[PDB]
From a paper:
Bacterial type I signal peptidases (SPases) are membrane-anchored serine proteases that process the signal peptides of proteins exported via the Sec and Tat secretion systems. The type I signal peptidases (SPases) process the majority of proteins secreted by bacteria. They belong to a group of serine proteases that utilize a Ser–Lys catalytic dyad, which differs from the classical Ser–His–Asp triad found in most serine proteases and in the eukaryotic endoplasmic reticulum signal peptidase complex. The human pathogen Staphylococcus aureus has only one active type I signal peptidase, SpsB. Here, the crystal structure of SpsB, the type I signal peptidase from the Gram-positive pathogen Staphylococcus aureus, is reported, and a peptide-tethering strategy that exploits the use of carrier-driven crystallization is described.
As co-crystallization experiments with signal peptides consistently failed to show bound peptide, we modified the MBP fusion construct to allow covalent attachment of peptide substrates. The peptides used were selected based on their efficient cleavage by, or inhibition of, SpsB activity and were synthesized with an N-bromoacetyl moiety that formed a covalent thioether linkage to a strategically positioned thiol group on MBP, which had been introduced by mutating Gln78 to Cys. Two (Pep1 and Pep2) are substrate peptides with very different C-region sequences which are actively cleaved by our SpsB constructs. In the Pep1 and Pep2 substrate complexes cleavage has occurred between P1 and P1′, releasing the mature protein sequence (residues P1′–P3′). The SpsB construct used here had previously been shown to be fully active, cleaving signal peptides to release a mature protein and cleaving peptides with C-terminal fluorescent tags to release the tag. This implies that the lack of density for the mature protein portion of the cleavable peptides Pep1 and Pep2 is owing to enzymatic cleavage and not to disorder of the peptide in the crystal structure. In the Pep1 and Pep2 substrate complexes, the P1 methyl group makes intimate contacts with the side chains of Ile32, Met37 and Val76 in the S1 pocket, with main-chain atoms from Lys33, Gly34, Ser36 and Met37 also at a van der Waals distance. In this post-cleavage state the C-terminal carboxyl group of P1 is hydrogen-bonded to the SpsB general base (Lys77) and receives a probable C—H⋯O hydrogen bond from Cβ of the nucleophilic Ser36 (C⋯O distance 2.8 Å, Cα—Cβ⋯O angle 104°). The Ser36 hydroxyl points away from the cleaved peptide, which is the result of a clash with the C-terminus of the cleaved peptide. In the Pep2 and Pep3 structures, the P5 proline directs the peptide chain away from the enzyme, with no residues prior to P5 making contact with the enzyme.
Numbering used by the authors:
A (entry chain A): 10 to 60, 62 to 407, 409 to 532
B (entry chain D): 189 to 199
Write the structure that this text describes.
Amino acid sequence: HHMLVIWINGDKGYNGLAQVGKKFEKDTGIKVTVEHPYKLEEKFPQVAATGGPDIIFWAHDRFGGYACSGLLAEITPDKAFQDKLYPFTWDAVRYNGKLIAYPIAVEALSLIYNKDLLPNPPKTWEEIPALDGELKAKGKSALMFNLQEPYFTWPLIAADGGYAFKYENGKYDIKDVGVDNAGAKAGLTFLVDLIKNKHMNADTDYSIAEAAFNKGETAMTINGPWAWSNIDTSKVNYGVTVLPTFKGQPSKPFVGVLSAGINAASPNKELAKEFLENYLLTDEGLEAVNKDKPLGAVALKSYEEELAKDPRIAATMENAQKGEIMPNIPQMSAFWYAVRTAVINAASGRQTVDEALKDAQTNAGAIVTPYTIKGESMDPTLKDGERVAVNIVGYKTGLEKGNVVVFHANKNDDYVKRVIGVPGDKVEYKNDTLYVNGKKQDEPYLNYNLKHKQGDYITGTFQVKDLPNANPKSNVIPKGKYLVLGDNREVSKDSRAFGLIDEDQIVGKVSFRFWSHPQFE
Amino acid sequence: GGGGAVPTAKA
Ligand SMILES: OC[C@H]1O[C@H](O[C@H]2[C@H](O)[C@@H](O)[C@@H](O)O[C@@H]2CO)[C@H](O)[C@@H](O)[C@@H]1O
């Protein structure tokens, strides 16, 4: 209740932001604490309810997910205040008609280069192999940048046609994903070729690339405005310019708007608003942050009119113009995770580009929704109160035996049971022995219950032909129908009672974490 | 997203 806690990423001007906090404290007596936890954008949903920060700073893309999860307060700037920021910046922080954060600054990646090593930066990605050859001859490299985060590789991937979700007629279509089209494949292939030919290393990360550029070991890097301070300190004579083209096409970075959201569970929402509107988003407040680590093109018109005079900001905005504003939809998290996996696997050689991007295409558009389990009839596989992630099954798409499915039982109730037979399968039980298509099928998920039973058998003999919604002449499950049973077979009310369910009732599949995995792969 | 409660599924 007494103070404000603020989370901002470790690459941003958090010391500058703390100075703004000190000013607010001096004026108001209210203490401001600035933290930069590792992967804060992932930690925030974990803690948000269980009081998390009062204010969270991140690029706008993560906020729709947070808003959809109920974690953010609607902000309430008046007309006068809204008019002080560029209208397009407010667009980035509007979700389902409501403003869900304060925009701070526009961030786009640029090509950063060492003028002493490379007085004329390359116009094309295609030049970089030969350039690297020349620089290797003097113990340097052409290009190093963070290959572990897809943000940095995306500009090249999107150059010849890759995209995240198609925006059309006022809406993003999350069924239309552009991760495995021809342009995406060509870009990712080029990146993999660079690595194969030792022009880049698949292990290069943020710190490795930053250290290399700032020590004069590589001629070029790709980074955002927040990086410029450290380069100033290093004394490298650097330029900031337009990203090179690929196959004749501009690189297309995803453009972020650094934004500040207010935790829905904060008891300090009024103080948060005062801090953001009257201290941070002023010429003085932004200057303090900007002098620590540059923000980019700020949302506040009065200060941006000064910052826009800087050629480096002109480069930033030129690259932004070829790129695109990130979507803010909840599905963005899944997209980024899918593309991060594809880039890592393709770059390490675990998968071919075609395989990696095929999986990413699938994973980027797969909807995942949380559920809570109620009752004992799946015990011990699922427990009463257990939180699970449910993979939504597309309208009429790939259910298989063994899938644990959530389904609508009626207008008011969803149930969860295991798929034991799919359409076309012939199924019966003899005591506790499952026969599918004439062959005994082991059920390892029943092991504990089979070995801790009250009665003679936990499932017991039955045939599909005797159940509701079955074909009474056959044990072959009809088209569109599913046989579902609860793992806690002795107590479960399932298809043995209510019969086969319909494909139209199925919501999705419960995802499970397997307890074992390799120690390195 | 909507901001509502997490749905429940009866086991
Ligand atoms: O790499 C995926 C990642 O991209 C963006 O994160 C950026 C962030 O926007 C920048 O402000 C800066 O901190 O670099 C980050 C990349 O490491 C998205 O904003 C983020 O949600 C996404 O996971």
